[PDB]
Amino acid sequence: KQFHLRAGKASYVMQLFRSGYLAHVYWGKAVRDVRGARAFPRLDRAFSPNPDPSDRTFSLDTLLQEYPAYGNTDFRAPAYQVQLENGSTVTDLRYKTHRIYKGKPRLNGLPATYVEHEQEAETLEIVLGDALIGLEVTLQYTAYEKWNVITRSARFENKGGERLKLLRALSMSVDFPTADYDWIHLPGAWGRERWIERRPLVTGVQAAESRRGASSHQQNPFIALVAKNADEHQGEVYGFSFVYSGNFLAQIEVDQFGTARVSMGINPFDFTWLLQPGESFQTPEVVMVYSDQGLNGMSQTYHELYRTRLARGAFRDRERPILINNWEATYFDFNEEKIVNIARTEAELGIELVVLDDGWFGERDDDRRSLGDWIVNRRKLPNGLDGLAKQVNELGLQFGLWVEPEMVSPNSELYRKHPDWCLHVPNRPRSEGRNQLVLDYSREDVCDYIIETISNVLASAPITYVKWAMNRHMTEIGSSALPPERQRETAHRYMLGLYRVMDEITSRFPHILFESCSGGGGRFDPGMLYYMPQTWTSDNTDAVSRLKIQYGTSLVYPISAMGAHVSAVPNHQVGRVASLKTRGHVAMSGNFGYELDITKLTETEKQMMKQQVAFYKDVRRLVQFGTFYRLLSPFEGNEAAWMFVSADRSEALVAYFRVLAEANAPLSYLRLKGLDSNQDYEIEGLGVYGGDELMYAGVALPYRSSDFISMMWRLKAV
Amino acid sequence: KQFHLRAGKASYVMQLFRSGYLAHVYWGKAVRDVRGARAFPRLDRAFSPNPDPSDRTFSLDTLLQEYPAYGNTDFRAPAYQVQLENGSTVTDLRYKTHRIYKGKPRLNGLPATYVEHEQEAETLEIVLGDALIGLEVTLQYTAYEKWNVITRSARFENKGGERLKLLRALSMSVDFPTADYDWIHLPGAWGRERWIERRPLVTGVQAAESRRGASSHQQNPFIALVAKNADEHQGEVYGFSFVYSGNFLAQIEVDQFGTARVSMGINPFDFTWLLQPGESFQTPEVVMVYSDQGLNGMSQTYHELYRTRLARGAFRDRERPILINNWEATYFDFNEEKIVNIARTEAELGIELVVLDDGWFGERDDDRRSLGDWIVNRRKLPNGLDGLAKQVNELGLQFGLWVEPEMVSPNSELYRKHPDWCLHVPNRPRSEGRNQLVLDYSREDVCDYIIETISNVLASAPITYVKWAMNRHMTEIGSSALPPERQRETAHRYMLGLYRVMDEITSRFPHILFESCSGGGGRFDPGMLYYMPQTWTSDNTDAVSRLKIQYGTSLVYPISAMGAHVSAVPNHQVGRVASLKTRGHVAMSGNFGYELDITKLTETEKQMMKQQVAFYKDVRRLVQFGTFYRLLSPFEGNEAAWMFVSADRSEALVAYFRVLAEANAPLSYLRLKGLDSNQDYEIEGLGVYGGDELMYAGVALPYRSSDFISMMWRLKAV
Amino acid sequence: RVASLKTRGHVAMSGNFGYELDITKLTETEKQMMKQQVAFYKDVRRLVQFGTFYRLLSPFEGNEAAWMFVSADRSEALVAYFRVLAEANAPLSYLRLKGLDSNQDYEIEGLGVYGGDELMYAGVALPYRSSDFISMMWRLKAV
Amino acid sequence: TLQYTAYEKWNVITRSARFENKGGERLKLLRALSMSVDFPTADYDWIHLPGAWGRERWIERRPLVTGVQAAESRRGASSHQQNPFIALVAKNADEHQGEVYGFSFVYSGNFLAQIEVDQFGTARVSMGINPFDFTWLLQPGESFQT
Ligand SMILES: OC[C@H]1O[C@H](OC[C@H]2O[C@H](OC[C@H]3O[C@H](O[C@]4(CO)O[C@H](CO)[C@@H](O)[C@@H]4O)[C@H](O)[C@@H](O)[C@@H]3O)[C@H](O)[C@@H](O)[C@H]2O)[C@H](O)[C@@H](O)[C@H]1O
């Protein structure tokens, strides 16, 4: 029996082998039929034991599997591992049956790529079963018709009479025949998230993971296998993106025979899951992309898929408003009068949205208290939230609010009433990060409280924007409402709760723009994008550092979700002094916004602020919804460049950046990509040059001095 | 509160920080005192939570530890992880006390590097403690006086009143300040063990491990951090060697802040350990070596340390006998008459030891039966063990035997008597590798049985040599004599059992040479070297393939234990045709031996073989106990070269190898290393060349044709 | 260097085929395959000498070397593979083809009818073999 | 006279120069290369075919240095040591993709295949008869074709 999935211009082929063994066959460019050219020569490998003594050529250590297990002759890292009551970890999944149907189903309490019409995707569910122990494992495969997308997840189910403990439950696993690849992941830190790191494969185990209860800044939930000569514009690329916002494991393993075991899912470290007879377990899905157009072709497939078939709400296809935030502007020292007097100026500038940041609730005068008491501070806001938001609305401005519902501070009224509502473990010191603690979302009561509490606050004023923040990673992980056996499920149940929490709140308010946040992109993952159509990219608002941040972030996530604000100089994070033009152009390459005190800006800068805003709305459709091409990498040199191309290839916008200036520098030229060569384009300020000329010859950049310069070009057909 | 350890020309520094926290400070070249030049600037790192709310600059995520834990603000991979009865994994280790005494102690039921005199080393034991659960962890540190050797291990003990479950118990952990290193491990397979692979570090986790219940050919228990510009003769090298023969994990992880956490110990995968109140668990040690003399300098301290302070018995410093094996010669088709008629010819050649291989016991006519019944087959050996061994003795040759006591075959009388004596799990198919099963060494009865049985077989004949084999990796790992809770200790208790059996047999018989074996070097680890002073390197007896194996193998393990035998052509593994000169030269570079059908060689080859034997006995003192220098790597080109130098640098032996012949090839030169420059040396057959010249200028190679060529040179002082 | 007549033949077959050795020292067995080699070349001589040439694997970059010849009308193709040094317990190798019509099927003699797209995008597996200096020949023709 | 030819079916541009003394004085050619082209950038690898007898034309790809790298023959023949062919290739260009600029010399004697990178990152690619130990006298009225 042969399973052949057609995903866009790609094919994912699988096959049943022997007595119900599931084997991998091929993943790559679209094929009409696999007649077995890649073949399958069986060999008796030394020290590779056999489940069938009559055949020495068959061993699980040497078989390409789709959902492999450890204990029975296979020694590579398994996709799953379960503990029985007798203590054994030996499992034997065999083929039971399978089903094929149009469309895409939702996963229980989990975010996933969706479909609006049956024609959009096709689903294959292969149900495997361990007859002896009565374990049922359902493998989910989905193939979109327009994109090279295969989404993979597994559903566990206890159909036996014994209790089962899940020690490992990864979302997917695939064995590549060879290992002649480089691998790309997105490491980083706070203020410098998601730097692109390409490394050659080592014979052994290399992996990216997070043990912080979040996708984290340190390791983004994404890995990708790339051909040795694959570049930014060409070459075969095999991407793996995890739709999950908690602990994850992105692991690649090369064995003795040069095969590459790529596995991805929830991090098995500090993780167990008890399955009582009758219960089931659903894993988040992993979106896999194949592409022959290099990293650009791969990213563009992720962009359209994530923007149109992962992002939700009414804003999924709507242009995002240019906003101004008061965080870096005023911090904690502010009041009602100080916010309203400048709102008039911002209206004249063309700003469409004003956002109130941290400091509006309880006694939020510092970062050491009041997290959890979501009541308006009469001290700075006499008329409160309702008075301010409605005052702003009649000025022609929308209103936005900042929240951090996942946090509880020691010095807070809710904590003195409920000290055991947080994530903690008995008789252990409750450590603090930024002097706050994380509440227990595994509880139904707190979730029902949190969904209800913030909803009334958000509905007590005409609000059209919400910024959900999270400035802490979980420590002393444990739950009081969970038994000693289950407790280790809290990390996942926390995420399951928040997924449920956001799902109800976002449903109650279809009129509100939701933007996830976590000290920047601490949870910039496909999981949060499903519930909130955009994310605050990075706390580092320096134009130069942002080049590295946005270029790396654009590898997986669409421009539409890429939050970018213009800040003041010298920057509060680095201290770098950059011009407002370049600082603008960098932020203009994402969801454009502002975050600085206008009262300290001069009329020259103030007038230029007017110039920037009016310019962006003309190209907002192009930047946020157009085809994105990366040209020059800031990771590979002194320059950085990218462009946006319209769907009909009639409009294009090009951005160029060079950081360090050198005296008597050589003349540079820039070759752009993705335009119609058979058409002519008019570059503003230069002339009408042929599209083919632009691709094959390129455009020369004007010689400039000074550090951190930028350039922008608008291209239109004739 | 400063721990300063001096090991030879190196220093290992530690410090107590605040309320009893153990921190790493420095490891490298010797310093008199660390007054804090490397310093320790504290910083408030974002998303790094604090156990002390008053100090935001204090976090376990940003401080270099010696034995870190997860759960309390540290998010990196911990050195250990304990499961409480309530299920939590949160531990809080604090400083209790410490003690310092001369010498080096032995580990409970475990092999370790030893000392013959008190003056050789000093040990520091730091007792750590978790007051709440009453858990005490004793950290062991050892400093040799003559070598740059650091061995580390930990002793766990439940000194509380509750039961504790070990999820992870690694032997050691060290946090490096920077990550500007390459990392080298020893991957491979059957027929190609321990290839040296150097790769640049990736930002995340890279690791080499084995889940096969053995050291395995796939991943050798050794990791090493090397400087980016470190070479074979110079540069800083940080080696990590594990004295263990079972499951292991050699993991290095670099975090967001460019620090390098090197951890090594028993593989936590498929491993748990129950500690009832009062009992203790001791982990094997990891020997770390520092060297500024490149890879050679690292190996040389490792070589003499392992031969003199790890290998045991009375043969530890004795010259190894030139042996001949009948495996590749006759395999299973042999009898008493067939060996004695050839015993006369082999006696004339100068062989010091003749070994009888697999096929002598039970019904070993195939490789699918008779494993476990260690009784002589009277049909193939009429006069039995007493008759045969005494027959060869009067010819002036010693006699040796092949055994695989850790094995049991389905087709054996021992299996029909005890079917539940093997590794198995309830109601699960018992998979076979090479049609055999692994015995349960976790059981005390099976251990007591095996020790007495094989010893008596070994005492039923005048035997002075034994080759212990292991030709299968464990499957369906579990034990019937262990409770549902402990079961996962089977992998470890097997090794504890195996360590005990060898411990008793090697003690009862100090007059017998023991050589470990496992389809080559499947267990070429310091653990086996402690009980058996040498190991059969690889089944691949091809001269060229062995060049790759031995060069990689010599990196960690001494030359004296490096088995090298001459085989027939075409080679039984690859099919490569090499000259007897070349086949000799490669085998002459290790523990010399023979393994081929003498009946098929012409008179010319027999006499040249005699010369090969005669040539080796002249230099066997030099190669096996001298200082070893690697010259040319077969991994870096078409050539391979190494040398042996006497302790007083008065005698030297040079070996050169070139694999592929090229027409009109350029003139090659070879520069030697490790000799005393102030003396002149006379090269046999050429002349007396200056010691300084051969090292700095080098020696020209004569041009010759044909593939797989070799040359050998003897150097002696004047 | 000592190489088999198959490989020494196959390598010479990648150009205008010819011989240069003492034939009197060759056995009759080698002589008959020699006749087969000559007959083999003239069948693809139009293809080899006038067809499109594709380099696959470089002997300068590793232990392998491979190339192929493709007809002008994309209906016929000939593939050559070479491996120099043999290693025990070697990993399975596969070969990705180029220059074929993906929308058409090809008949490789002795193997089967595989899709043209499959040959380029998935590639063809090589049988595990021992000994040094080996060679293989593949004939591809449309249907 | 600079000669340029463009084939219709192939991507072939052939370049050569024709010298002619149309004056009344005698002229000495110290160098008469066949062609020369200045590339705007020098972000390329360069491929030539060095070797020897019994090992002719091995492919050697090296990154460009800021200065002069060149392959030539002073043996009166194309020689086994350096084959009369050089090519500029993109950094990520392989056997199947990438922009490649090849330069082949139709000559069997002394040759010079030279690439020069200046201070401003431009690439001077020149090819023709090796000017070393080579001169050409042009009496009034005669001509020289390279
Ligand atoms: O609460 C609103 C805010 O929340 C998200 O980001 C918060 C993010 O940044 C924080 O830094 C602010 C602070 O940093 C500096 O101060 C210290 C030391 O004095 O530096 C440490 C960080 O490196 C920080 O812990 C210390 O406070 C700086 O001096 C000062 O000017 C700044 O005000 C904080 O570090 C961190 O925990 C995070 O919470 C969200 O991304 C924002 O949009 C916004 O909503």
Ligand SMILES: OC[C@H]1O[C@H](OC[C@H]2O[C@H](OC[C@H]3O[C@H](O[C@]4(CO)O[C@H](CO)[C@@H](O)[C@@H]4O)[C@H](O)[C@@H](O)[C@@H]3O)[C@H](O)[C@@H](O)[C@H]2O)[C@H](O)[C@@H](O)[C@H]1O
């Ligand atoms: O018995 C003593 C022996 O034990 C150790 O080596 C065992 C190790 O190597 C074995 O190879 C010998 C075997 O190989 C061939 O057999 C097959 C097919 O016929 O080839 C496969 C190898 O990948 C093997 O699985 C098949 O049996 C071949 O016929 C012939 O050369 C030999 O009969 C065996 O292959 C493997 O399973 C392992 O068990 C120890 O290393 C030796 O020193 C020696 O003591």
